[PDB]
Amino acid sequence: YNPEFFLYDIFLKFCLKYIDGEICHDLFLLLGKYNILPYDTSNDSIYACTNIKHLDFINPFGVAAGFDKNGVCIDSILKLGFSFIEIGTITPRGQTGNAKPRIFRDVESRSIINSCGFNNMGCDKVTENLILFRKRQEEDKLLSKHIVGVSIGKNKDTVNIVDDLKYCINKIGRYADYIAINVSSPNTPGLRDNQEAGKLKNIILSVKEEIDNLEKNNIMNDEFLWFNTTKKKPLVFVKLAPDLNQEQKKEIADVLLETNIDGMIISNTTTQINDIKSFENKKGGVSGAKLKDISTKFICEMYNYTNKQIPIIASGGIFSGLDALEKIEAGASVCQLYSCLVFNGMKSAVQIKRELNHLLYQRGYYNLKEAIGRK
Numbered sequence: 479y480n481p482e483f484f485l486y487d488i489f490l491k492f493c494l495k496y497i498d499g500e501i502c503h504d505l506f507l508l509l510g511k512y513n514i515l516p517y518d519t520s521n522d523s524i525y526a527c528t529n530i531k532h533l534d535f536i537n538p539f540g541v542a543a544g545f546d547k548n549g550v551c552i553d554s555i556l557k558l559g560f561s562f563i564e565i566g567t568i569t570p571r572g573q574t575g576n577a578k579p580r581i582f583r584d585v586e587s588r589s590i591i592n593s594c595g596f597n598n599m600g601c602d603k604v605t606e607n608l609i610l611f612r613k614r615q616e617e618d619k620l621l622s623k624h625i626v627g628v629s630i631g632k633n634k635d636t637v638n639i640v641d642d643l644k645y646c647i648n649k650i651g652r653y654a655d656y657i658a659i660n661v662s663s664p665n666t667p668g669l670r671d672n673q674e675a676g677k678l679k680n681i682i683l684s685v686k687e688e689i690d691n692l693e694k695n696n697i698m699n700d701e702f703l704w705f706n707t708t709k710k711k712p713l714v715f716v717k718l719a720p721d722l723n724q725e726q727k728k729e730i731a732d733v734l735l736e737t738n739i740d741g742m743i744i745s746n747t748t749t750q751i752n753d754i755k756s757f758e759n760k761k762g763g764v765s766g767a768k769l770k771d772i773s774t775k776f777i778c779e780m781y782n783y784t785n786k787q788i789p790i791i792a793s794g795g796i797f798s799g800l801d802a803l804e805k806i807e808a809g810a811s812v813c814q815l816y817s818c819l820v821f822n823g824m825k826s827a828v829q830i831k832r833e834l835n836h837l838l839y840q841r842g843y844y845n846l847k848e849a850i851g852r853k
């Protein structure tokens with residue numbers, strides 16, 4: 479509604495029409511880096527707060543992983559009106575990823591296909607970006623209480639998947655509110671097989687353990703140990719790909735229950751969309767509108783399978799207050815956006831927060847927490 483947002487969104491639409499996606503993506507990241515994007519300075523509704531365990535979100539919308547892989551634009555992105563962002567996915571060593579162009583959008587179906595292949599500057603460089611973010615944060619009143627999770631993964635050619643995760647934890651864990659374990663990218667060969675249950679249980683317990691050791695091995699009080707938002711050790715979530723068996727899902731559910739994981743991100747992109755014409759050429763995982771139903775059903779299933787015991791972070795095809803309410807009613811406690819920013823632009827968090835609040839009122843819910851899981 480504001481003019482700053484209005485002008486940027488025209489520009490963004492122009493870019494969407496004329497300019498390659500990855501290039502546009504990076505241009506807006508660079509404009510955020512230089513602090514020339516608009517801010518949402520509005521108080522968020524106390525009735526749409528949410529939490530995962532003791533991690534509290536001032537509103538229920540965050541930016542999904544893969545958006546700001548390297549943490550170069552964290553302040554500007556949160557300042558668009560998001561309560562949190564998941565940076566990464568990061569790996570121990572930097573990787574260039576797959577040959578470009580490797581991201582395409584289909585404006586008509588509001589859908590995206592990418593085969594990025596975990597391109598990122600590497601754990602050490604991103605840790606230094608996140609540290610500078612944490613320092614800015616102590617000085618920047620609009621960043622107070624905003625959450626930064628870190629998605630962490632394996633280098634493509636890795637000796638020890640678990641070892642890669644430990645290396646990332648050891649480096650960046652002190653600066654993270656939460657850690658997301660990503661064994662779900664379509665785009666690194668294998669990796670996805672790391673969703674095998676015995677393997678996954680060991681992954682999850684190795685990660686909680688490396689985090690536990692961060693707490694142990696240093697002498698400072700928590701307030702100085704955790705240079706993050708919570709002042710507590712990061713929670714542990716796992717991100718799940720939606721292309722799985724019911725049996726696979728049930729198995730994963732039991733490993734999540736067995737290991738007392740703090741949450742699950744449902745879901746990553748799908749390789750099962752066949753009917754987007756412009757994508758016929760293409761290899762990779764599809765995001766956006768055409769993922770929404772698959773992702774929502776998957777939320778229902780895992781909530782059920784896990785007996786409502788594991789909080790869900792929703793991802794996939796969320797554009798509108800209605801889409802968000804569906805995620806929440808299926809069982810999600812919090813939502814992440816990606817595609818919506820691409821097609822709808824900079825106003826997305828402002829607009830969707832407003833839409834969800836009105837909806838919550840119309841359906842006669844007292845607050846958002848009351849709606850979670852109401853089938």
Ligand SMILES: Cc1cc2nc3c(=O)[nH]c(=O)nc-3n(C[C@H](O)[C@H](O)[C@H](O)COP(=O)(O)O)c2cc1C
Nearest residue numbers: 542543544566567592746765766793794795816817
């Ligand atoms: C270009 C691109 C890169 C992505 N990179 C990652 C990543 O590094 N890690 C990750 O867990 N998910 C990644 N994703 C998946 C998103 O985090 C998200 O789950 C997916 O886009 C579904 O949300 P959407 O339908 O709102 O876009 C990426 C998606 C896109 C489109």
Ligand SMILES: Cc1cc(Nc2cc(F)c(C(F)(F)F)c(F)c2)n2nc(C(F)(F)F)nc2n1
Nearest residue numbers: 493494499500502503506507581819820823824
């Ligand atoms: C016009 C456009 C913009 C976009 N990225 C983008 C990147 C951004 F940083 C923002 C912002 F500023 F709000 F945080 C944004 F709204 C969109 N991508 N990203 C793609 C991608 F990644 F899918 F290729 N295509 C795009 N097209």
Ligand SMILES: O=C(O)c1cc(=O)[nH]c(=O)[nH]1
Nearest residue numbers: 594595596663665747763
């Ligand atoms: O780097 C990527 O290719 C990528 C990672 C991921 O987790 N999901 C995705 O769709 N792409």
